[PDB]
Enzyme design. Structure first.
Site, PDB file in Angstrom:
ATOM      1  N   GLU A 166      26.997  75.837  26.448  1.00 57.93           N
ATOM      2  CA  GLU A 166      26.647  76.102  25.050  1.00 57.93           C
ATOM      3  C   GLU A 166      27.461  75.248  24.084  1.00 57.93           C
ATOM      4  O   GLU A 166      26.918  74.707  23.106  1.00 57.93           O
ATOM      5  CB  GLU A 166      26.848  77.575  24.724  1.00 57.93           C
ATOM      6  CG  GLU A 166      25.825  78.524  25.352  1.00 57.93           C
ATOM      7  CD  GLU A 166      24.439  78.391  24.778  1.00 57.93           C
ATOM      8  OE1 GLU A 166      24.232  77.679  23.758  1.00 57.93           O
ATOM      9  OE2 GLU A 166      23.535  78.957  25.403  1.00 57.93           O
TER      10      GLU A 166
ATOM     11  N   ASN B  62      19.120  75.112  13.922  1.00 57.85           N
ATOM     12  CA  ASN B  62      17.810  75.260  14.548  1.00 57.85           C
ATOM     13  C   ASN B  62      16.678  74.992  13.570  1.00 57.85           C
ATOM     14  O   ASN B  62      16.843  74.990  12.346  1.00 57.85           O
ATOM     15  CB  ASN B  62      17.680  76.663  15.136  1.00 57.85           C
ATOM     16  CG  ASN B  62      18.746  76.942  16.148  1.00 57.85           C
ATOM     17  OD1 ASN B  62      19.571  77.838  15.983  1.00 57.85           O
ATOM     18  ND2 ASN B  62      18.782  76.120  17.178  1.00 57.85           N
TER      19      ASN B  62
ATOM     20  N   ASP C 209      14.210  76.803  12.782  1.00 55.13           N
ATOM     21  CA  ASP C 209      13.865  77.928  11.921  1.00 55.13           C
ATOM     22  C   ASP C 209      14.865  78.136  10.796  1.00 55.13           C
ATOM     23  O   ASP C 209      14.730  79.104  10.042  1.00 55.13           O
ATOM     24  CB  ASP C 209      13.729  79.212  12.744  1.00 55.13           C
ATOM     25  CG  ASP C 209      15.046  79.729  13.293  1.00 55.13           C
ATOM     26  OD1 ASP C 209      16.094  79.069  13.175  1.00 55.13           O
ATOM     27  OD2 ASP C 209      15.033  80.836  13.868  1.00 55.13           O
TER      28      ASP C 209
ATOM     29  N   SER D  41      18.091  78.817  11.069  1.00 54.18           N
ATOM     30  CA  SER D  41      19.291  79.497  11.501  1.00 54.18           C
ATOM     31  C   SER D  41      20.243  78.487  12.130  1.00 54.18           C
ATOM     32  O   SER D  41      19.880  77.346  12.418  1.00 54.18           O
ATOM     33  CB  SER D  41      18.957  80.608  12.493  1.00 54.18           C
ATOM     34  OG  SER D  41      18.529  80.068  13.730  1.00 54.18           O
TER      35      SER D  41
ATOM     36  N   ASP E 280      23.637  78.224  15.063  1.00 50.84           N
ATOM     37  CA  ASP E 280      24.392  78.801  16.165  1.00 50.84           C
ATOM     38  C   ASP E 280      25.868  78.442  16.011  1.00 50.84           C
ATOM     39  O   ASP E 280      26.196  77.298  15.689  1.00 50.84           O
ATOM     40  CB  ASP E 280      23.896  78.267  17.512  1.00 50.84           C
ATOM     41  CG  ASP E 280      22.439  78.561  17.764  1.00 50.84           C
ATOM     42  OD1 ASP E 280      21.982  79.655  17.421  1.00 50.84           O
ATOM     43  OD2 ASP E 280      21.761  77.695  18.335  1.00 50.84           O
TER      44      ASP E 280
ATOM     45  N   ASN F 206      23.803  83.215  17.071  1.00 54.44           N
ATOM     46  CA  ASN F 206      22.813  82.776  16.094  1.00 54.44           C
ATOM     47  C   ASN F 206      22.834  83.626  14.834  1.00 54.44           C
ATOM     48  O   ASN F 206      22.938  84.853  14.898  1.00 54.44           O
ATOM     49  CB  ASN F 206      21.419  82.853  16.726  1.00 54.44           C
ATOM     50  CG  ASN F 206      20.339  82.356  15.826  1.00 54.44           C
ATOM     51  OD1 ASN F 206      19.654  83.141  15.155  1.00 54.44           O
ATOM     52  ND2 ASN F 206      20.157  81.042  15.799  1.00 54.44           N
TER      53      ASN F 206
ATOM     54  N   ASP G 245      21.918  94.136  24.913  1.00 53.89           N
ATOM     55  CA  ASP G 245      20.514  94.129  24.549  1.00 53.89           C
ATOM     56  C   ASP G 245      19.677  93.961  25.817  1.00 53.89           C
ATOM     57  O   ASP G 245      20.194  93.686  26.905  1.00 53.89           O
ATOM     58  CB  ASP G 245      20.235  93.012  23.539  1.00 53.89           C
ATOM     59  CG  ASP G 245      19.003  93.270  22.692  1.00 53.89           C
ATOM     60  OD1 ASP G 245      18.190  94.146  23.068  1.00 53.89           O
ATOM     61  OD2 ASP G 245      18.849  92.581  21.654  1.00 53.89           O
TER      62      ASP G 245
END
EC number: 3.2.1.17
Length: 129
Positions: free
Chosen positions: A35, A46, A48, A50, A52, A59, A101
């Site tokens: 990562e 990103n 969209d 957003s 990271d 994110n 999650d």
């Protein structure tokens, strides 16, 4: 801060990630390698809008607030900047929420594509732990 491999393993173990939700320490070290290349200051934007952040590339659409991601949920209740610290506490605490999650470590693209189903024990071999 750019961590050494065993230095990061030792920090993650101290913070309780070894076998957290069943993922051995090598999985977490492998994820961090691919990562962020073990660099706490890593950021990536990103499509969209957003971004990271940090050693585990958490994110801003869901997990932290960076003031520029409309509709962010800030589920870890932290500024994204806190995830760039040389102290990995905030990143670890937030990663624990993420991995609890439904999808586990599949939430991390680099883990799914570069660590899952490989010999992840190799990432902690030789380390004093």
């Amino acid at each position: 801060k750019v961590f050494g491999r065993c230095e990061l393993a030792a920090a993650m173990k101290r913070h309780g990630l070894d076998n957290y939700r069943g993922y051995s320490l090598g999985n977490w070290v492998c994820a961090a390698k691919f990562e962020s290349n073990f660099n706490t200051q890593a950021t990536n934007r990103n499509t969209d809008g957003s971004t990271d952040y940090g050693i585990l590339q958490i994110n801003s659409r869901w997990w932290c607030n960076d003031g520029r991601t409309p509709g962010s949920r800030n589920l870890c209740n932290i500024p994204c900047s806190a995830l760039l610290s040389s102290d990995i506490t905030a990143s670890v605490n937030c990663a624990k929420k993420i991995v609890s999650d439904g999808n586990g470590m599949n939430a991390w693209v680099a883990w799914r594509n570069r660590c899952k189903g490989t010999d992840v024990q190799a990432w902690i071999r030789g380390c004093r732990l």
